[PDB]
Design a protein around this motif. Sequence first.
Motif, mmCIF file in Angstrom:
data_model
loop_
_atom_site.group_PDB
_atom_site.id
_atom_site.type_symbol
_atom_site.label_atom_id
_atom_site.label_comp_id
_atom_site.label_asym_id
_atom_site.label_seq_id
_atom_site.Cartn_x
_atom_site.Cartn_y
_atom_site.Cartn_z
ATOM 1 N N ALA A 89 3.415 16.404 -16.119
ATOM 2 C CA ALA A 89 2.142 17.097 -16.440
ATOM 3 C C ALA A 89 1.994 17.361 -18.197
ATOM 4 N N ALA A 90 3.177 17.865 -18.528
ATOM 5 C CA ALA A 90 3.113 18.256 -20.227
ATOM 6 C C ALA A 90 3.119 16.887 -21.161
ATOM 7 N N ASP A 91 3.722 15.763 -20.364
ATOM 8 C CA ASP A 91 3.848 14.591 -21.147
ATOM 9 C C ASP A 91 4.023 13.191 -20.290
ATOM 10 N N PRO A 92 2.684 12.832 -19.811
ATOM 11 C CA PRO A 92 2.768 12.020 -18.911
ATOM 12 C C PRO A 92 2.682 10.446 -19.416
ATOM 13 N N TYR A 93 2.678 10.454 -20.824
ATOM 14 C CA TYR A 93 2.467 9.207 -21.451
ATOM 15 C C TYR A 93 3.479 8.091 -21.222
ATOM 16 N N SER B 189 0.631 -1.216 -0.058
ATOM 17 C CA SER B 189 0.164 0.105 0.084
ATOM 18 C C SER B 189 0.658 1.193 0.045
ATOM 19 N N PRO B 190 2.256 1.209 0.381
ATOM 20 C CA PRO B 190 2.917 2.613 -0.101
ATOM 21 C C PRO B 190 2.839 2.697 -1.706
ATOM 22 N N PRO B 191 2.620 4.040 -2.239
ATOM 23 C CA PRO B 191 2.788 4.263 -3.482
ATOM 24 C C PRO B 191 4.417 3.634 -4.218
ATOM 25 N N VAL B 192 4.240 3.487 -5.416
ATOM 26 C CA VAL B 192 5.284 3.320 -6.093
ATOM 27 C C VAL B 192 6.068 4.474 -6.771
ATOM 28 N N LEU B 193 5.157 5.309 -6.917
ATOM 29 C CA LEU B 193 5.562 6.533 -7.799
ATOM 30 C C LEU B 193 4.629 8.055 -7.045
ATOM 31 N N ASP B 194 5.395 8.971 -6.960
ATOM 32 C CA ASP B 194 4.839 10.053 -6.546
ATOM 33 C C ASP B 194 4.685 11.043 -7.755
ATOM 34 N N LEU B 195 3.741 11.252 -8.210
ATOM 35 C CA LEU B 195 3.415 12.061 -9.456
ATOM 36 C C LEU B 195 3.711 13.588 -9.286
ATOM 37 N N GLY B 196 3.631 14.061 -7.897
ATOM 38 C CA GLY B 196 3.915 15.435 -7.798
ATOM 39 C C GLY B 196 5.354 15.565 -7.960
ATOM 40 N N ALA B 197 6.245 14.615 -7.332
ATOM 41 C CA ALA B 197 7.781 14.539 -7.278
ATOM 42 C C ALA B 197 8.522 14.848 -8.877
ATOM 43 N N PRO C 119 -0.833 19.426 -13.589
ATOM 44 C CA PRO C 119 -0.293 18.253 -13.428
ATOM 45 C C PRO C 119 -1.329 17.019 -12.940
ATOM 46 N N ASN C 120 -2.530 17.489 -12.347
ATOM 47 C CA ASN C 120 -3.454 16.612 -11.699
ATOM 48 C C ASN C 120 -3.776 15.645 -13.007
ATOM 49 N N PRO C 121 -3.679 14.141 -12.543
ATOM 50 C CA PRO C 121 -4.030 13.239 -13.734
ATOM 51 C C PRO C 121 -5.162 13.183 -14.021
ATOM 52 N N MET C 122 -6.257 13.780 -13.530
ATOM 53 C CA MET C 122 -7.584 13.600 -13.693
ATOM 54 C C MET C 122 -7.566 14.397 -15.065
ATOM 55 N N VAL D 29 -0.123 4.915 -6.411
ATOM 56 C CA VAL D 29 0.701 6.150 -6.558
ATOM 57 C C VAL D 29 0.269 7.348 -5.755
ATOM 58 N N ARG D 30 0.841 8.379 -5.605
ATOM 59 C CA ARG D 30 0.366 9.594 -5.047
ATOM 60 C C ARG D 30 0.177 10.677 -5.951
ATOM 61 N N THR D 31 -0.851 11.324 -5.973
ATOM 62 C CA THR D 31 -0.998 12.319 -7.029
ATOM 63 C C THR D 31 -0.245 13.761 -6.564
ATOM 64 N N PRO D 32 -0.314 14.577 -7.463
ATOM 65 C CA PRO D 32 0.322 15.831 -7.100
ATOM 66 C C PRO D 32 -0.404 16.543 -5.904
ATOM 67 N N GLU D 33 -1.408 16.204 -5.900
ATOM 68 C CA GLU D 33 -1.980 17.022 -4.923
ATOM 69 C C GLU D 33 -2.107 16.218 -3.511
ATOM 70 N N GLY D 34 -1.353 15.140 -3.455
ATOM 71 C CA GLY D 34 -1.135 14.341 -2.229
ATOM 72 C C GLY D 34 -2.020 13.282 -1.797
ATOM 73 N N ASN D 35 -2.970 12.851 -2.781
ATOM 74 C CA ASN D 35 -3.744 11.786 -2.604
ATOM 75 C C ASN D 35 -3.049 10.540 -3.095
ATOM 76 N N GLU D 36 -3.361 9.416 -2.043
ATOM 77 C CA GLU D 36 -2.904 8.101 -2.563
ATOM 78 C C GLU D 36 -4.035 7.238 -3.268
ATOM 79 N N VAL D 37 -3.929 6.904 -4.492
ATOM 80 C CA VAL D 37 -4.879 6.259 -5.222
ATOM 81 C C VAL D 37 -4.399 4.935 -6.203
ATOM 82 N N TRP D 38 -5.034 4.465 -6.863
ATOM 83 C CA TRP D 38 -4.610 3.252 -7.737
ATOM 84 C C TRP D 38 -5.094 3.839 -9.187
ATOM 85 N N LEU D 39 -4.038 3.653 -9.946
ATOM 86 C CA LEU D 39 -4.030 4.058 -11.439
ATOM 87 C C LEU D 39 -4.437 2.522 -12.020
#
Length: 396
Positions: free
Chosen positions: A15-19, A1-9, A381-384, A34-44
């Motif tokens: 954000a420009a090219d997340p692909y 349950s810890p994230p594998v990737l912090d998208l904020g970091a 940067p928000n992945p949504m 993952v953790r999103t740039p806003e600080g939320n831990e979620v599954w992608l």
Amino acid sequence: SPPVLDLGALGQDFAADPYPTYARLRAEGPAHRVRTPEGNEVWLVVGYDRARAVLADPRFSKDWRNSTTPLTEAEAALNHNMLESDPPRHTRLRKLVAREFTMRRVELLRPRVQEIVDGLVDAMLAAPDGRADLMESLAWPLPITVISELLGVPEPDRAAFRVWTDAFVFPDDPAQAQTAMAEMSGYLSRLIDSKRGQDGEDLLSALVRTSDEDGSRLTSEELLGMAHILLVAGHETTVNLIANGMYALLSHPDQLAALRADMTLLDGAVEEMLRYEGPVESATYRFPVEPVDLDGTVIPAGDTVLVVLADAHRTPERFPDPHRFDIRRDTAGHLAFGHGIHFCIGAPLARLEARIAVRALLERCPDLALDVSPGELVWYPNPMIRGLKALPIRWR
Ligand code: HEM
Ligand code: NA
């Protein structure tokens, strides 16, 4: 349950090219913490087939009663809406407005949408130096004007929505998004109270009478939730479609020239804008009602799950040569409006706005071009959300 990737970091490059990030996840398997740039831990959830399956899978709930994440007052005030519901609540709420949004009902809006776009393009072309920000001149004002007219939001009240959505999408900090939620909730409660007993014929006036005629059909909390969802979902993505789609078209001169040579390619071009550069990078929150095993990765019950539409649309088994913007491609089956019982109720209206705007720009700006190098654009940067802060353009 810890994230594998912090998208904020990863910063603005992500954000420009997340692909490439999402494609690397997809190669490892379908689901990732993952953790999103806003600080939320979620599954992608990544990969076209798994994304399409989860969107339609009733094991993944949209009702926050199935989330283990607790809500603020402000959050809870706004969540009695169809996108954050499951059947039967979903079923009941969507039925109340399904008729407003059919292809045939939307088609009656065409002349007014055309008038709005003609007016905004008239004002743009009046610019002194033949330059504008497409965001400010067209992409933002068109959809907010259309949903505001439909609902009944007075003209001086509308500018606040850009402030609020800016706060929800790219918050300076968490307090700021909570404040904007509280402000918006209070404003909508004021706007609902201001329609009551006024005999208005706009959609919000009808919904206020629907609630007052029978609170079991639409309760006062669902009335506020319906105003919220229709106003926010009813413009915010259309704005970014228009700007993202026009950035794509102007970035690809061969496709722009193919469209100019044959304007009957316009609807397919707007579909490939959805497929290639759609505004919903990841779908809205889903919560497994029980643990769900996706090819050996078990998502716990109650965790937040984001379906990454953007990565589904770059899955090459489903969309060959996926990184090519091709207005003639077979786009049928893209996920830009979702899939399953929550499939966008706005799709005919979004298409009508985007088709009219793209046509008016090409017809009225024969020498339309980007007035910015790609490296000066700023993406969220928000992945949504896939969208730009501004889109400078220039014409003859
Ligand atoms: C290009 C523009 C648009 C795109 C890309 C878009 C995309 C989406 C997507 C992906 C969903 C489903 C989300 C999920 O399953 O998590 C959705 C739902 C929804 N959309 Fe749109 N949308 C657009 C425009 C609009 C407009 C113009 C309206 C105004 C009516 C609207 C109203 C809604 C509402 C109310 C829902 C919730 C439907 C439900 O839960 O049954 N959208 N949209
Ligand atoms: Na983003």
